[PDB]
């Protein structure tokens, strides 16, 4: 369910203009850059606490977004390809209680 | 749902004493904030000298303020017919009354009628958990 | 017939239990070969019907079931566990040159012939020479008094030691266990199994066993131990009635009396009256007064006469010591076990609302819209539940802020040892105070 | 303790048809009105020039309580004998036995005002008397 | 993290009175800067002559303003259902309430609802260190 | 949608004397005060020991609107039955049928506050419920 | 038993000290030869039952 | 080894119950008397649930 939900959420970036290391966005363009994509994905992951993911451990490290240029070697990467690594953590539910009773008089 | 004093359902069946017709049971509704008020013990007592008490025959009465139903003649609510009322409170108690009769009719404005019902005995459902 | 043509289906039959079973009891004993029941297999006996046809005629188990059915008229389903005499078992033999067992068994050559023709067919000794119908030490507890000589010739020996409780009765939970043998090893093994039922590592069938120990004062204590799983019933050396009958009557009365009222102490001439058991009128109540006091102290159930039906005192278990702490009267009284079981099952039922409920641990708090919780709120809810049950399950309290604690597994186990979702609830309750000594001074 | 109010109210019901005894059960006040008492078992009357005609009467008791949902409403309206005991916040205890409800007034099914009539009501008089 | 006044978690469980459907426990949020207000002692006192006080039985009330959840009908916030509310403050205190009823339903605009919750008793969790 | 407010207000007028129906005409909000609701058709009352008395009551609606110049002012002050329908911004819809104005106020001729009473008011609960 | 199937796993026990030790005390004195304790060795005494032995 | 019921019947009941309860609620563990109950499958009354504690 988390996988399909993430796939549905990420559909907004398919076909969207992307500005890589080259430069920043100019006025009027409807593009984006990896930092803003990572921020949006991070905030979406934060907003789904309690229904899809756990609370968290350290959100500055569990979510990373990398362009395909900086993963594969020189002249090996391809434009418009991204590598997203996320360490899931399922929500905590009920389990053993281990009741201990010590009566008195 | 307990710990709430009130009345949930009121069912009244009219049995005319002239034509021997039967109408009901028809659900009714409260006219104001006063609740129906009961008396189950069919014996009334009287104070005597030095702790003793005199027990005499009496009846199980009932005061039922209800809104009249426009499909029913007003005379039925005022003692011209016999009523079999059944009231269920929110705590589960069900008071059942059969072969009743209104004793002291009062002039009604045409919407709200207060019955004074009498019967031999009133049964209490006493929701589960008893004695 | 008219008026029944549709809309209503009558089902008139007098065999319909609208309540449904309740408070099952198990009787363990030996059966003779005359029966038709498979040994070492728990079976349900549901009437004062054939019985004999299944567990034999005159067997100790047959008489135990008869007394159980006499004491208890309704509200229990009775189970039996037949046993077979050991291969080396030697039948005890008695000789007569009259009261035997209980009242309904009571009755030169011409005398003997008529007496045998009047001896009850279900008497557990074959008829004057009397021979035990079962092989073992059980036959050694027969007493015949003329209310004529009777001094025995042969002493039985060798008793079965099954040790098959786990395989035979695995998870059929029981409330009262009745064992009709004086073999100390068998009683100890039943103790071990019943304690294993109260194991923290497995789901528990809270039960209780009732056993007897007949003999002199010196040796009866040597039979007892510190285990509260059984209600040791002390019996004097000159006990007239067959011990297993008294034990079965006590167990059945306790089971039917408590059942759905697991708080009543089995005492008093009205609530602890073993009506079925009958004894000849007598003055000496078995044990002496000092003997009675010593048995009272060391967790032994003492019984006394009220034909006179007997009566029991000190309805307690054989619980005298803690791990090594002397003062522990928590499980002394027999009713304390029933209160503990009822409290445990009630607390388990109450805690059921946390199944699958999202738990937000130390790191953060609950976000709006989620149906989760955190340990502090659960602890508060448990505290209020404990408060609301004061007067029916617990005493008032000593310090509720100190007697109830909730701890997550993360903060109890070391780093990376704990696992999420598991909690640890520590609670020191107190059984409600009831009637006791008044110490009236006039 | 400089405080007025009841702390515990205990009523035991004895049916007059089956001789079944129920209780005692702790009850609750229905409103701010406190139970009222008339312990002195004789009722006086005024006569000419200071004299009083001394006549026998009852030790009455007006007890407003909230009915228990495990007890029939008829038991609160004269269909059973009541054996009521009450303790006030100052330690005073009134004890009543073999009492009966005298004038059952028609009630709504939650709060019942019981007019109990008894032979005599005993008082505890917390430590320090006369 | 003491020395701060406010609530951290608000848990409400709705139990319908006629259908008997249990919903919750759902977390809620404040509608404004006014904190929930409590009253634990279930006895209301009164003034008499010369320092005497008459103890009359009363309730442990609790005033609780919350923002209604869009998944729950508004009628549930105005007395058509029971509530089992539980509130945790920033200083560790927890108020636990069961079998509560809203007494005076005040008209609400459809987003913020002010509850006047009445129950038999309110329990305080009293963060560690007592008496 | 995190935006508290009303988007449409529809009112249908049924004259009580001539039995003429007019509407449903869209209306206009006069000021920043939003319509106020009460759906629970029962009014509770505080009692002792946590008990509550449930008394039958009516569902109300305080709806301030701007009058329409094609409709007589008497229709907004109790001379006609009203069928009000209000839809909030977050998708919620309140439906009221066979209403009545209980306590008309002295209005200036432009803005009127309608105190409407009906047996029950419906709620639409935008998708996703319970 | 009923509903005692997973989740709640009861561990009722008379002796469960939930505080843990606290403010230890040492007692020194002479003993007879009937004891079974090692002389000149500090040991923790569980309770009063075994002191004589 | 001494299981009375035909194994495929119990397997099908378990699979159907699990899928059918989860469907749009992919969080509920199929367990407990309330949720882990195979209503269709029936057995004769017995006291030995097959496996003993150790192999359980």
Residue numbers in the entry:
A (entry chain U): 393 to 497
B (entry chain E), E (entry chain C): 3 to 133
C (entry chain T): 4 to 100, 113 to 122, 132 to 151, 158 to 177, 192 to 350, 358 to 493
D (entry chain B), F (entry chain F): 4 to 133
G (entry chain j): 4 to 56
H (entry chain U): 281 to 336
Sentences from the paper on this structure:
In the initial extended (pre-attachment) conformation, virtually all tails in cryo-EM images were bent, complicating the reconstruction procedure. The curved tail structure was reconstructed by dividing the tail into overlapping segments. Fragments with a common curvature were clustered using 3D variability analysis and used for reconstruction with no symmetry imposed. As a result, the surface of the tube displays substantial grooves at the interface of two rings that are not found in straight tubes of other CIS. In the curved tail, these grooves are smaller on the inner surface of the curve when compared to the straight state, showing that these grooves enable the bending. The backbone traces of the tube subunit in the baseplate-proximal straight region and in the curved middle region of the Milano tail structure are virtually identical with an RMSD value between their Cα atoms of ~0.5 Å which is at the level of experimental error. The curvature is therefore realized at the level of side chains, which adopt slightly different conformations in the grooves separating the subunits. The interactions of sheath and tube subunits in straight and curved tail segments are very similar, suggesting that these interactions do not constrain the bending. In the extended tail, these charges are neutralized by the sheath (specifically, by the SHD), and the tube-sheath assembly is flexible. The cryo-EM map shows that each sheath-subunit forms three different disulfide bonds with neighboring subunits, covalently linking all subunits together.
